[PDB]
Structures are given as structure tokens and as C-alpha cells.
A and B are shown apart, each in its own frame.
Chain A
Amino acid sequence: KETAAAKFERQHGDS
């Protein structure tokens, strides 16, 4: 399911 590192990217990434 979603790791903490995956959640950070989903929430804050915008490459």
C-alpha cells in the first residue's frame, strides 16, 4: 500500500 516516501511524492512532487 502507500509507503511514507510514496505519499510525500504524491502530495508534494510536481516534476
Chain B
Amino acid sequence: SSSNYCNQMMKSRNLTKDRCKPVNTFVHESLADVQAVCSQKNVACKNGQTNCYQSYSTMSITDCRETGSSKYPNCAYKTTQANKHIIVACEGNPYVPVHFDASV
């Protein structure tokens, strides 16, 4: 809870205001294009359920990973930017992303 994108965004989005969340991914794409993944390549989820979908193309993502020296309240994060296929678990009507399963 200092500067760099992950520290700023984890705090602003309320992920680290009351704990330091170990890992979080931000997707730099329009939300409707991320919701569009739920009708793209169906794949098994790590847990063997099959409501997961892999994006046809890679997307711009920022991975935020807590450093080994982070302790609440001063959460600290390593920022890694990547372009990866995202795998999301989908539910409901509208069938929409509710969990990340991976990035590949």
C-alpha cells in the first residue's frame, strides 16, 4: 500500500482494504468482450466441472502477486503485464463470468 498499479488498484477496488489478497488479475479489455468468452471454447475447469470457457484470442492482463515481504496492513505486490488466453467459469442467465480459472 504504496505506489505501482497493483498496489493502487487492489486498494481502490477494495481487495486489500481489509486483508492482503495473494493474487489478482486485471483484464484490460472491454467488459462485454470478457463476457463474450462464455460462448467461446468450452473446456473442463481444474475441478473437472465443464462450465469453463477459454478465450479464442489472447487479452492484455496485469497479474498482481503479493511479494514474500508483504504483511497487512502494508500489502506489497509485484506487477507483471502479459497477453494471455483467459479461462473463465460462467453461470446464470445471462451466462456471465463469475470466476477466473486461469490464463494460458
Contacts and interface: CB of A to CB of B under 8 A. Distances in A.
Interface residues of B, number: 21
B69 interface: no
Interface residues of A, number: 11
B9 A14 contact: yes
Interface string A1-15: 000110111111111
Interface of B: 9, 13-15, 24-31, 34, 62, 91-92, 96-100
B44 to A, nearest CB: 20
A12 B25 contact: yes
A9 B31 contact: yes
A8 B28 contact: no
